[PDB]
Amino acid sequence: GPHMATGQDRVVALVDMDCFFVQVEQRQNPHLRNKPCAVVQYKSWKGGGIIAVSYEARAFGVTRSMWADDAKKLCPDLLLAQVRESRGKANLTKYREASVEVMEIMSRFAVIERASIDEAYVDLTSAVQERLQKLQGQPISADLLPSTYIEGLPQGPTVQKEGMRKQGLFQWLDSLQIDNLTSPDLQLTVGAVIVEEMRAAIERETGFQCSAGISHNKVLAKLACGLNKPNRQTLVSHGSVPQLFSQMPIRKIRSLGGKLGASVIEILGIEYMGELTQFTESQLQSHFGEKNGSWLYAMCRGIEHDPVKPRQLPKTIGCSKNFPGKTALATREQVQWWLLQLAQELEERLTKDRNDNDRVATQLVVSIRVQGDKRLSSLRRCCALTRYDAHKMSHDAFTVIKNCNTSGIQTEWSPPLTMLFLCATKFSAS
DNA sequence: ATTATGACGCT
DNA sequence: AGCGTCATA
Ligand SMILES: [Ca+2]
Ligand SMILES: [Mg+2]
Ligand SMILES: [Mg+2]
Numbered sequence A: 001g002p003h004m005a006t007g008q009d010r011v012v013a014l015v016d017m018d019c020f021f022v023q024v025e026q027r028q029n030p031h032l033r034n035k036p037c038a039v040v041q042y043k044s045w046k047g048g049g050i051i052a053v054s055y056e057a058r059a060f061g062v063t064r065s066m067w068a069d070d071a072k073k074l075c076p077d078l079l080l081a082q083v084r085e086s087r088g089k090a091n092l093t094k095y096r097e098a099s100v101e102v103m104e105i106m107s108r109f110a111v112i113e114r115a116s117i118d119e120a121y122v123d124l125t126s127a128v129q130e131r132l133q134k135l136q137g138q139p140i141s142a143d144l145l146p147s148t149y150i151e152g153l154p155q156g157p158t159v160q161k162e163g164m165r166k167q168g169l170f171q172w173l174d175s176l177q178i179d180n181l182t183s184p185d186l187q188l189t190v191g192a193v194i195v196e197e198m199r200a201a202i203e204r205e206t207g208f209q210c211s212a213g214i215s216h217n218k219v220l221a222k223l224a225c226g227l228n229k230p231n232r233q234t235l236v237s238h239g240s241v242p243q244l245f246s247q248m249p250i251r252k253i254r255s256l257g258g259k260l261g262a263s264v265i266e267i268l269g270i271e272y273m274g275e276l277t278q279f280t281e282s283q284l285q286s287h288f289g290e291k292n293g294s295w296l297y298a299m300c301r302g303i304e305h306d307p308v309k310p311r312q313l314p315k316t317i318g319c320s321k322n323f324p325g326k327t328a329l330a331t332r333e334q335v336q337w338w339l340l341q342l343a344q345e346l347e348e349r350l351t352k353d354r355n356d357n358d359r360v361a362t363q364l365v366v367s368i369r370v371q372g373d374k375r376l377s378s379l380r381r382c383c384a385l386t387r388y389d390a391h392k393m394s395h396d397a398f399t400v401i402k403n404c405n406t407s408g409i410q411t412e413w414s415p416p417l418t419m420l421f422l423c424a425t426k427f428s429a430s
Numbered sequence B: 001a002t003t004a005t006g007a008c009g010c011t
Numbered sequence C: 001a002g003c004g005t006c007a008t009a
Helices: A020-028 A068-074 A093-106 A125-135 A161-174 A184-206 A218-225 A238-246 A259-268 A273-278 A281-288 A290-299 A332-357 A390-404
Strands: A012-017 A037-041 A049-053 A079-082 A112-116 A119-123 A148-150 A210-215 A233-235 A317-322 A329-331 A359-370 A379-384 A412-429
Touching: A012 A184, A012 A218, A020 A037, A020 A049, A020 A093, A037 A068, A049 A068, A093 A112, A093 A119, A093 A184, A119 A218, A125 A184, A148 A161, A184 A210, A184 A233, A184 A238, A210 A218, A218 A233, A238 A273, A259 A273, A259 A281, A273 A290, A281 A290, A317 A332, A317 A359, A329 A332, A332 A359, A332 A390, A332 A412, A359 A390, A379 A390
Parallel strands: A037 A079, A148 A233, A210 A233
Antiparallel strands: A012 A119, A012 A210, A037 A049, A112 A119, A317 A412, A329 A412, A359 A379, A359 A412
């Protein structure tokens, strides 16, 4: 009843760049613009592995993780841009720097949480209050929401896409109560107006387009964002949740795409998020633990409390390289050469980070994989990170791992290593 | 032989 | 601490 919380206390958005690495390359090389194209890393093995795909290329069935040689079978005219290689390895600097461009623009509108290289959550609650004041009871024009979809509309008593969008938008705005400064639906709508503005600024100042979700929490915002891509934004209201979830596979919700989601489906014998409402909170906690159970009980009702954390910078800086199949490292000289290559890239990024962001990493984590282990990581050991010096870091990394060498011979390494990873962590102010 | 990342949970 | 899960380009 009147004491039942409804998770409508915040306005949260999730902004996510469209085919991000592709846009970065298309900005740089106008010949790639408005083409089926993809970004690939390496080239020798099957033409390289695809890591990003333009929407034009997606239409041919080209996807992430496809080998370029195979993508070309689906899309013969597919254009490719290659990730830079430095020190024998893929170097992602260009995309990290482009990400900083976008994050800095977003930060002008609101506090953001960097969620990945190309997405951020935004807490718009305060910005919406402010805007509502300027608005002075004044209605919101559809003109202010030129790329917004309202999930669930139109409904009730045209055959084109933009026409449908506008019909739904009209129904939404027609039903809005603008004299109520605490109406959650109104708050969301003003949130969407601001996100249009944010998205316009990103595109004007970088050339990059993005999509966005606006709702009352991060999970719904994230879900909303993916509903209409590319170059569009979607508002998911509290009221839209029961219908939206009634046919929403559990795996589509953030954090349920893996083993836990599979267990929810298996144990409960359900398929869709909305089906969760029929279980008590204790029932869910009994299956999935106290934390997950409470989370599931609220989430299937559209409610979630995880805050947008004030964090624009990554918490770790790492460098890693796989050495698959035949290329596995089998000599000490090999292992040491590559630890050095990694350590040199890490030093470069750490030094730039110290200058830009006034902080220093204090721990170095070293991880490897050995030929034969199904797990991505085989062994992870940390040591002190006291100086930004590549030779020192690589010498230290070798020290902490050198006893993983089964080989009775000093010069030989066995079993061969199929992955090396150096990660700087535990930052302190400087 | 997707690879190169990055955040957070468990014990 | 070291390991596991889930996620994104
Ligand atoms: Ca994206
Ligand atoms: Mg993304
Ligand atoms: Mg993606």
